[PDB]
Amino acid sequence: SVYTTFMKSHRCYDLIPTSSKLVVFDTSLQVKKAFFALVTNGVRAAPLWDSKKQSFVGMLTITDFINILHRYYKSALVQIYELEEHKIETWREVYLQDSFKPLVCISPNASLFDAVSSLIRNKIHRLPVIDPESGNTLYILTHKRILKFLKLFITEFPKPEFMSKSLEELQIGTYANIAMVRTTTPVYVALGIFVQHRVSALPVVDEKGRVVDIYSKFDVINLAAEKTYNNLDVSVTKALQHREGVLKCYLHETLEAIINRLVEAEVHRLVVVDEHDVVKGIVSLSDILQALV
Amino acid sequence: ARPTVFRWTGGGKEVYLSGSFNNWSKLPLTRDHNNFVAILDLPEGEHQYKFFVDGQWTHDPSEPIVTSQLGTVNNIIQVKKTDFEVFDALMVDSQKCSKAPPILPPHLLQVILNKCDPALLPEPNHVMLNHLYALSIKDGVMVLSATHRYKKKYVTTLLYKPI
Amino acid sequence: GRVKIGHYILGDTLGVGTFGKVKVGKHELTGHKVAVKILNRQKIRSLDVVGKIRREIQNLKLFRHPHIIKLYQVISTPSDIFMVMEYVSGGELFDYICKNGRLDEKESRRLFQQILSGVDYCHRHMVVHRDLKPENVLLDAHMNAKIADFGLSNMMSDGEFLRTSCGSPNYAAPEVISGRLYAGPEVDIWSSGVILYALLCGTLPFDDDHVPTLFKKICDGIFYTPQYLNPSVISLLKHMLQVDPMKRATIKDIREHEWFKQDLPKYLFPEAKWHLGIRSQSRPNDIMAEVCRAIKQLDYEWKVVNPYYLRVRRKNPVTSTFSKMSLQLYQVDSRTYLLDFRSIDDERPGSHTIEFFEMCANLIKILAQ
């Protein structure tokens, strides 16, 4: 492999932007205020500071909101008291009660290969970069940032044998038992699929097998933004009304073009669609990085 | 050997330096404006010198002296190893050396948080780094912010802490 | 009968700088000329300028720009310190502007570009050369500008300001003559602005025999623009010589200016309300009395430097790591006063940045505004 040796050379520090923002929440902070802060500041994830332990215990992402929302929603007629009045540490001790997963972090001096491996190894999307000397969190590294950096090198350096090869011939990503929703499907049900299947996005399908829209974990953040989280009975299509044409890829298309299509549109995954505009599979940013490492 | 300066602060027509280092032979000092000098190198150790100022043998009283058993008052110089290396000599010199409120600079009033990606921020002025900024306590929770530089990149950290 | 240091024969005195005498030095064999700054160790310790020289040597050694005098070697003797630097035949730029008239738009620009290039190199190296005048700009045989005398120059530390009111009154910025706290580069821009005027006019923009009216004239930022002056350069001078440092030009703003860019050679240049701390409206001594009664209440060791500047330390209950932060009381207005919180970088642990926020949050919760 040629791309694997490139990742092992470049350090995490080279991916950190010239000047950035970093939101850190205290574990004692009210969880509802924590999600509203993710929205207001415009960040998808934040490291969690335990004032008593004096260390970064974890990360607060949309998955936490998806989990609280599904685990504690009763109806639109009654408020989610548990979300309204709960600290971050209180819910973290409930969620990670049986399965206790510690903080997954990378050093800026550590190679990008190690960072890409650490993401798949722990099955996560957000990896915080922490300096060993200071102990401070510097930047939260994602698949999209690595893919944007890798695509800059792929276009300059000569294209390998699989770049000109088809997506079907190489077999990259999940193609069997695809987790999907319908137009009539409510948000609570959709949130439930996100919980058990542990996937980033659910393709919204019409009366027929053809895919009309895509409901991502990011679209859940809108409920916190619009202060509309208390009504999860609403359909997926109704929730997506707040905002574009749907992006899809075919099984006969080349891997180099598929990589280019994702980074140009700035999306986490593309839908593997057949001739009759119906869902056949899926290809995530995590999958492309897996084959390349 | 290390070069040593012998300067004569005081008048005269003819000034000579005589020392243990040159077997007490009279060495003429050059005059610029009014002062007389000689830069000659000496081995690291003890050296005794004297001056011959216009037919008179004298010692510089500002410089350290040593009186002989025979009653010979000569100037002394202890050329140390530290006297040859610049940063060693400046280190030993530092060791040898033993209201109204300031008006707020307008630079500190300039922020990178108030003045596209929400995570991406403008490069801050070196002077506003490590300074603590805060937000008015709303909903009983305090928000703190500061910009710190790691290597050649800047990191503005926001802390949501309840009070 | 030759006075020799290194391998050069010391000659005539070129002048007397900030802390020392400067002499010519012709090589024993090659005849190569150098400028030797002679600093008497006993004299440079009489003034507590020992640290100032240590820094100046450190900086000038690392530097290598075509319009900044190169420091070749430093020779130490038991009595004095000899600073061997490059020699330039052309002498002072000030003297050029005196003996000959004012420079033409073309030559004025040429030399201004070269000076600003060097002024930029200094700032890019966190070194601010205060005392930037045509007396300190030297010229070579081929009319090239060369920045000299870094005696009054100081470092640009992260988070810290400068106070010293150093340099000639005519070239000094309004904040310098007012003795107010400055960042650093903005005062060199003002100095570079007056140098520019001096080149184009042959005279000073701010000058009077009466010192009080001169200081008023500087703080009023008013200067005469002669009819022969190009309105484009007048706009540059107006932006450069701004009384307000926030309204003043940056090396970037100058690089972008139309008059500067003209015939500029390639070799010269490369390439939701937030508040700072708390605002207690009490008496300046009464605020300092409240913070000391609050620092000790939170069990923290401190050392008072100024009646308004304090350095505090606190031991971590878990990692046992000691973290430091500085407090400074500024005057916003005649009615309101503000307290500033600044982090102090130390020398595996917890997190330096978050630990600093924890400290401040404690003292803010028990303070005014």
Ligand SMILES: Nc1ncnc2c1ncn2[C@@H]1O[C@H](COP(=O)(O)OP(=O)(O)O)[C@@H](O)[C@H]1O
């Ligand atoms: N570095 C980390 N340390 C601890 N927990 C983490 C870390 N990164 C993610 N998590 C947890 O992993 C779970 C799933 O997160 P993730 O896949 O990254 O979601 P998202 O795609 O919205 O960013 C969450 O419960 C989150 O708290």
Ligand SMILES: COc1nc(N(C)C)ccc1-c1cc2c(C(=O)O)c[nH]c2cc1Cl
């Ligand atoms: C008379 O002194 C000199 N004469 C020289 N000639 C070429 C005749 C050269 C150098 C000096 C000199 C001057 C000073 C000094 C001063 O002049 O204040 C202080 N420390 C000095 C050390 C030396 Cl070697």
Ligand SMILES: Nc1ncnc2c1ncn2[C@@H]1O[C@H](COP(=O)(O)O)[C@@H](O)[C@H]1O
């Ligand atoms: N809708 C989906 N159904 C099934 N698997 C999916 C779906 N979306 C993503 N995946 C898979 O989930 C894994 C992690 O991807 P992701 O969480 O989408 O970044 C990859 O192996 C994807 O192929």
Ligand SMILES: Nc1ncnc2c1ncn2[C@@H]1O[C@H](COP(=O)(O)O)[C@@H](O)[C@H]1O
């Ligand atoms: N295949 C896709 N085609 C079009 N939009 C998509 C696709 N996948 C996700 N999105 C949109 O991307 C946004 C979420 O972004 P993210 O999960 O960060 O990539 C939502 O607005 C989704 O509707």
Ligand SMILES: [Cl-]
């Ligand atoms: Cl002089």
Ligand SMILES: [Cl-]
């Ligand atoms: Cl020359």
Ligand SMILES: [Cl-]
């Ligand atoms: Cl003049």
